[PDB]
Amino acid sequence: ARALDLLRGLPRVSLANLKPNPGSKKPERRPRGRRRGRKCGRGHKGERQRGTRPRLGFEGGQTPFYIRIPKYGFNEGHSFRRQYKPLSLNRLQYLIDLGRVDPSQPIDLTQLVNGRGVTIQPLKRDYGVQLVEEGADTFTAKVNIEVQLASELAIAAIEKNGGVVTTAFYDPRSLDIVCKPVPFFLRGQPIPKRMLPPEELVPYYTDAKNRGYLADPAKFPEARLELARKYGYILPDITKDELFKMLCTRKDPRQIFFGLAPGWVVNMADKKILKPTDENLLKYYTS
Amino acid sequence: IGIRLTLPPPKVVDRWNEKRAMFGVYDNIGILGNFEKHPKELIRGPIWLRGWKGNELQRCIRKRKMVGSRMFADDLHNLNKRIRYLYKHFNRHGKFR
Amino acid sequence: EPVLRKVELPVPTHRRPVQAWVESLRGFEQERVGLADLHPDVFATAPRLDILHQVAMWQKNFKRISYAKTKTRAEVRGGGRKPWPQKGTGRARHGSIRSPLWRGGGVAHGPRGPTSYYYMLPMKVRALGLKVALTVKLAQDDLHIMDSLELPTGDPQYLTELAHYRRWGDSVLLVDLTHEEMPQSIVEATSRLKTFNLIPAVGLNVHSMLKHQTLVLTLPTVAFLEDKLLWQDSRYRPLYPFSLPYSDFP
Amino acid sequence: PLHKYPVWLWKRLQLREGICSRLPGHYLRSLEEERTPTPVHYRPHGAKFKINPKNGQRERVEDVPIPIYFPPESQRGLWGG
Amino acid sequence: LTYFSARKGKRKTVKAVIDRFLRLHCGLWVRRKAGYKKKLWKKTPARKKRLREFVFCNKTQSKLLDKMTTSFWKRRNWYVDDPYQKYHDRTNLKV
Amino acid sequence: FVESVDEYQFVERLLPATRIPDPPKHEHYPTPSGWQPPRDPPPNLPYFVRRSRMHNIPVYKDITHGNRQMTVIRKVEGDIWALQKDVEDFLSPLLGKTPVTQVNEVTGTLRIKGYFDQELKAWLLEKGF
Amino acid sequence: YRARPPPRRRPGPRWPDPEDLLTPRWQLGPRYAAKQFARYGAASGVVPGSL
Numbered sequence: 008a009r010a011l012d013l014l015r016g017l018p019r020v021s022l023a024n025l026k027p028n029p030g031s032k033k034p035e036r037r038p039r040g041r042r043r044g045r046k047c048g049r050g051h052k053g054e055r056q057r058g059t060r061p062r063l064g065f066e067g068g069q070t071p072f073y074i075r076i077p078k079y080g081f082n083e084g085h086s087f088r089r090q091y092k093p094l095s096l097n098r099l100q101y102l103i104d105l106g107r108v109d110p111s112q113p114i115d116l117t118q119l120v121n122g123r124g125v126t127i128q129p130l131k132r133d134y135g136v137q138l139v140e141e142g143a144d145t146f147t148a149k150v151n152i153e154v155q156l157a158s159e160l161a162i163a164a165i166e167k168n169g170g171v172v173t174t175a176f177y178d179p180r181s182l183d184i185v186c187k188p189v190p191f192f193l194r195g196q197p198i199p200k201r202m203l204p205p206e207e208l209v210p211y212y213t214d215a216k217n218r219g220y221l222a223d224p225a226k227f228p229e230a231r232l233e234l235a236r237k238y239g240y241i242l243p244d245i246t247k248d249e250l251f252k253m254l255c256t257r258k259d260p261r262q263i264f265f266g267l268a269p270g271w272v273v274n275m276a277d278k279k280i281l282k283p284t285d286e287n288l289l290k291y292y293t294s
Numbered sequence: 295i296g297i298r299l300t301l302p303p304p305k306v307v308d309r310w311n312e313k314r315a316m317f318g319v320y321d322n323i324g325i326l327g328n329f330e331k332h333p334k335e336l337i338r339g340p341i342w343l344r345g346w347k348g349n350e351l352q353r354c355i356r357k358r359k360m361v362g363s364r365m366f367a368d369d370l371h372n373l374n375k376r377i378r379y380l381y382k383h384f385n386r387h388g389k390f391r
Numbered sequence: 392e393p394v395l396r397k398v399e400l401p402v403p404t405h406r407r408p409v410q411a412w413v414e415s416l417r418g419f420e421q422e423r424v425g426l427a428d429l430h431p432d433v434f435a436t437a438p439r440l441d442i443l444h445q446v447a448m449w450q451k452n453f454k455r456i457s458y459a460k461t462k463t464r465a466e467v468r469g470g471g472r473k474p475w476p477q478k479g480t481g482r483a484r485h486g487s488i489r490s491p492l493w494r495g496g497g498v499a500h501g502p503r504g505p506t507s508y509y510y511m512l513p514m515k516v517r518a519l520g521l522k523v524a525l526t527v528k529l530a531q532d533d534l535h536i537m538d539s540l541e542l543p544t545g546d547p548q549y550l551t552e553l554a555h556y557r558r559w560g561d562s563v564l565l566v567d568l569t570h571e572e573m574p575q576s577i578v579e580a581t582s583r584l585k586t587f588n589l590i591p592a593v594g595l596n597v598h599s600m601l602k603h604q605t606l607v608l609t610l611p612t613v614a615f616l617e618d619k620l621l622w623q624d625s626r627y628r629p630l631y632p633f634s635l636p637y638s639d640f641p
Numbered sequence: 642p643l644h645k646y647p648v649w650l651w652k653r654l655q656l657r658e659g660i661c662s663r664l665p666g667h668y669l670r671s672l673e674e675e676r677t678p679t680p681v682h683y684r685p686h687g688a689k690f691k692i693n694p695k696n697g698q699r700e701r702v703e704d705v706p707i708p709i710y711f712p713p714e715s716q717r718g719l720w721g722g
Numbered sequence: 723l724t725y726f727s728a729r730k731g732k733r734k735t736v737k738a739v740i741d742r743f744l745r746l747h748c749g750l751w752v753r754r755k756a757g758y759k760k761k762l763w764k765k766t767p768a769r770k771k772r773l774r775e776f777v778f779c780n781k782t783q784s785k786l787l788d789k790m791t792t793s794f795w796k797r798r799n800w801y802v803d804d805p806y807q808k809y810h811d812r813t814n815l816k817v
Numbered sequence: 818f819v820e821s822v823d824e825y826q827f828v829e830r831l832l833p834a835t836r837i838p839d840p841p842k843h844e845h846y847p848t849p850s851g852w853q854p855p856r857d858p859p860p861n862l863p864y865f866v867r868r869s870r871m872h873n874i875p876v877y878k879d880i881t882h883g884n885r886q887m888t889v890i891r892k893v894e895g896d897i898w899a900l901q902k903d904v905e906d907f908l909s910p911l912l913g914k915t916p917v918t919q920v921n922e923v924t925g926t927l928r929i930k931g932y933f934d935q936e937l938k939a940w941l942l943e944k945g946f
Numbered sequence: 947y948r949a950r951p952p953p954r955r956r957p958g959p960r961w962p963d964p965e966d967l968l969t970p971r972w973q974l975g976p977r978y979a980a981k982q983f984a985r986y987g988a989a990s991g992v993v994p995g996s997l
């Protein structure tokens with residue numbers, strides 16, 4: 008290069024030559040001298056100087072600003088209002104193109120995260136992903152996406168290209184397992200079983216309009232044709248697709264991973280999966 | 295007068311003993327070792343400070359938590375007094391509110 | 392019989408590799424035994440001395456505990472009672488014989504407790520510093536390459552004479568691959584010497600390189616270094632510590 | 642400095658060193674073992690979980706025993722608990 | 723406020739604010755015009771109209787309330803049906 | 818009580834990867850999102866502008882003091898001054914004046930006043946970076 | 947000077963003796979044994995059925 012040629016005719020680099028990058032190490036300030044310290048910046052006598060002025064927000068006895076304004080539930084319940092990380096179609100296309108997610112394989116939450124497409128935080132009351140309509144135009148991909156919500160426009164964008172989208176549910180205990188599985192397989196606990204939605208959400212996941220994972224898989228064609236008829240395209244017959252066997256695959260409720268049955272134990276050290284045989288354990292897990 | 299008259303004895307420093315010749319070795323054990331270990335796991339020192347930093351109040355709180363029940367009675371009483379004072383100072387005294 | 396070596400990891404298509412001689416310790420005049428190729432992004436990075444400074448200062452300070460304690464005004468023995476009343480006498484007001492003012496009192500603002508100075512730079516910055524150090528010790532005709540650190544006999548006189556014969560410098564940092572595989576001769580010889588230091592590749596660091604003048608890597612070591620340092624550019628952001636199993640990470 | 646064992650482990654250490662070390666095993670087991678007294682002066686919460694009214698979520702609950710004083714005169718009688 | 727807790731050593735928030743103000747993610751704070759629920763029978767209809775409104779807080783108040791609340795209450799919050807979802811971002815701001 | 822099964826195929830689909838995978842050999846460009854690969858062989862110019870870990874154009878918006886808008890062209894290698902002259906020529910017609918700029922020849926970056934991220938990304942695409 | 951042998955992680959499973967008093971409460975029980983099994987395989991010695 009150019010600089011590497013400069014270094015040849017300079018002295019050897021050593022710990023006697025180093026330097027900080029200029030502008031980084033701002034100099035220090037100490038109260039010594041006629042400028043820094045005669046009162047060291049603290050001002051005249053008064054409780055300002057002694058370090059005894061009232062608490063942050065005390066307006067001198069007048070009723071503080073943050074106490075003369077009435078209460079209102081702007082935040083009541085905030086710890087329990089569920090949250091969902093958006094996954095815009097723009098982002099899904101971008102991830103597909105650069106080879107991060109694989110559209111020739113069912114796209115669940117695990118494969119969105121293992122491609123670093125979204126960052127899920129179970130501990131902050133994120134329940135999962137929601138597809139958003141942004142970028143409905145220019146989305147051209149055949150994906151079998153399993154998300155936790157979807158606007159009807161996203162359902163359209165995924166259908167118009169011969170794709171299946173299904174809205175599942177994940178409870179806060181299993182969402183952590185699905186989002187970061189290898190930690191769970193390290194804990195040594197047997198794979199739990201997904202809980203069912205809460206009371207307020209079953210009417211959502213048992214409705215064909217939302218491709219719910221608990222609605223009857225016979226009202227779906229009516230929903231798909233209705234959506235197509237409203238959004239002016241022709242519902243492609245997916246049954247003839249070259250890899251429709253994949254777009255069909257779905258996770259039944261009470262299952263976290265695709266080919267794993269609740270109650271199994273993953274042994275990563277030896278590359279094995281251990282299954283129980285006691286009848287009571289199978290009874291508990293299969294329910 | 296507060297200045298010495300004779301010259302001090304010469305403090306001879308051996309810049310190539312074992313401690314200096316091998317300083318820093320294994321400070322990239324993580325990046326160059328498949329991340330088995332971490333640099334903090336080479337910090338030798340107090341139980342309650344290996345790989346952690348903070349102001350005096352946090353340091354004293356941490357000392358109390360991790361070895362408070364192993365401390366001598368008078369040292370522990372001093373520590374509690376120190377925490378009490380630092381709480382008062384850091385939370386009520388100062389230029390900035 | 393030459394001992395060539397090509398760069399394994401992909402090179403960007405707009406940069407040619409750098410090259411170096413492959414020497415031997417088996418004889419005084421055994422330089423230019425072969426020719427080795429070195430990956431441009433690990434041996435020809437931008438100079439960037441300021442990053443070398445950042446890394447050396449971190450490598451100095453991150454493992455420092457200052458064991459300096461000074462008894463505050465309430466930790467020094469005695470000192471409870473008021474020495475004399477406030478109004479009566481003609482002396483200065485005082486409420487203890489252990490204030491900082493008094494002799495034998497406590498320090499108002501002194502070194503408190505054992506203090507830790509730990510902090511960690513982004514891992515990428517430290518890998519970048521390693522690359523910068525290697526390239527600076529190449530650009531200035533100080534880096535060497537050896538097929539192996541083998542020697543004829545373990546006598547240290549031989550190694551120090553050989554280092555004299557080739558303008559190596561005052562001090563040499565020899566780097567081999569694994570701590571178990573360093574040959575007997577080099578370990579025996581470098582135990583006695585003082586400015587020659589033998590380390591396995593996992594210990595290479597910026598400060599220990601800027602200290603010694605000459606740096607002498609084995610060939611397996613440069614392969615190892617290229618692998619472990621090129622891995623930092625073109626890796627995802629972590630999902631959890633790289634000590635946990637990943638699909639592609641040994 | 643620092644002790645090699647905490648303060649509350651000194652009792653258990655003493656029960657292994659001297660004359661206390663030769664006591665029969667079952668006595669030591671009956672001594673070290675701790676059991677909570679049956680609730681007497683407080684109403685114990687029935688279950689391990691409960692729904693509270695202020696918000697409506699399922700919060701955990703424990704029962705924290707009231708601390709009760711037994712003057713030495715009771716050691717000569719049967720106050721129950 | 724409490725700049726360091728005695729038990730953990732972190733900053734602590736003044737919960738009297740959380741129950742009164744809403745932090746739009748990109749700086750603003752919204753309040754509710756004290757004097758609005760009570761004594762609504764001798765207030766003119768225009769005044770009642772004014773008092774129902776959600777108003778913003780000026781710069782000094784916003785900085786103050788930013789100080790009295792830790793980082794958690796400033797994050798990006800993706801609520802399902804948030805009536806204030808569209809106000810989290812400024813659009814076309816000149817200086 | 819337990820029996821060992823070594824199918825195991827459905828956990829390895831869960832292990833993430835650490836390396837960013839090479840983008841696949843698409844058949845048309847620009848891809849539906851708008852991603853082109855860099856030309857080959859690299860264009861013959863004084864300088865070069867590397868692609869990031871995720872293969873995008875290193876042109877980044879930046880803001881300070883709430884009113885200083887800036888952009889940075891970051892991983893510039895070679896003669897950064899040639900790129901400065903080229904960028905000044907390319908932007909001068911748009912703003913109606915030569916745009917003030919900083920060159921940091923050490924880190925290898927060119928910082929530009931104003932927000933011109935999309936323009937600069939397009940322009941660095943045309944030249945084949 | 948030959949640099950000291952590198953710092954390697956404590957190999958194999960870590961079974962702390964249960965009779966000692968310092969061995970904390972959480973290094974004996976079912977959870978630690980489960981973690982050791984999960985992280986080291988059949989060599990850890992944990993009987994799988996306990997999981």
Ligand SMILES: [Mg+2]
Binds near residue numbers: 036
């Ligand atoms: Mg200062």
Ligand SMILES: [Mg+2]
Binds near residue numbers: 068
């Ligand atoms: Mg008053």
Ligand SMILES: [Mg+2]
Binds near residue numbers: 465469470471
């Ligand atoms: Mg005293």
Ligand SMILES: [Mg+2]
Binds near residue numbers: 486
């Ligand atoms: Mg006094």
Ligand SMILES: [Mg+2]
Binds near residue numbers: 462467495496497
């Ligand atoms: Mg003293």
